[PDB]
Write the structure tokens for this entry.
Amino acid sequence: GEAPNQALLRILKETEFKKIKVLGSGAFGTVYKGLWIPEGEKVKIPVAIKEPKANKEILDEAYVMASVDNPHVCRLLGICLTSTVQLITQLMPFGCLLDYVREHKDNIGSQYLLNWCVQIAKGMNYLEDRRLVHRDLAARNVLVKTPQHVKITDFGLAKLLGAEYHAEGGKVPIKWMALESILHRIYTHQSDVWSYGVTVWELMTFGSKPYDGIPASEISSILEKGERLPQPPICTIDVYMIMVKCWMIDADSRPKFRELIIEFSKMARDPQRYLVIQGDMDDVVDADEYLIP
Ligand SMILES: *CCC(=O)N1CCC(Oc2cc3c(Nc4ccc(Cl)c(Cl)c4F)ncnc3cc2OC)CC1
């Protein structure tokens, strides 16, 4: 009872796109921005390009990104098979939501924060429909297309469940993981809900570091001792109670992604009741409008 993944993997000519700038660099490789002009099409699509034996890793990320299609999940546009392997995706001009929430903290309203909480829950709920566990949900891994539209990205750690994933050992983001993921290395859709709670806490604190000034090894014990992240200042008890529910030790008593949509959507209908913030070329086609079946 496992469905065939009939997603299409589009191979892109190196001619079809040009690089423009370097958006970011890390070990493996650098992420760049550029334009993609499919030959004989008269369209220019703003894209972001990301170019060992780690090719097995980047090709696993491409498989996952090519198999998702949701307004709040970044989809792979294609890959380029030159001397280096490149991943081409739609350009998210405003960067990651973590940096955006930091560089604009004096201009972000409750309506935007709660809407972001709704959109991330919508994208996370879609990944659960597709039986996909992200395992690395964080504010740094949510990209901003427009201030009103954010999407989930970075599926390097994502794993597809059959019809409870048991990792072995890898550089993992300790401070965002559920307690069972720390101790047993078990990952469930409800393990992503814990990460979702930390991600919401990142937004409501305008980019603060969770457990700032704490060793990563001491985290497993303080979570057993009953300790969680503090109530952010702008957070009513209503919003903070939801974040606390995502961090319960019993994983099945945690909120579901389908329910986090409903609760935050109800809150976005009256944002100031739940968040208290002081003073509330020519042929360019966005990739969300370029659809080839
Ligand atoms: C906040 C953390 C941080 O330092 N960075 C994250 C955002 C980067 O800037 C931009 C990145 C992208 C990406 N990234 C991307 C991720 C996975 C894959 Cl496979 C591919 Cl191909 C990617 F391109 N995607 C789309 N748009 C942007 C836009 C960015 O800034 C404008 C820099 C480092």
Q: What stands out?
A: Residues 23-24, 31, 48, 50, 61, 65, 87-89, 91-93, 95-96, 98-99, 140, 143, 153-154 surround R2E (CB under 6 Å).
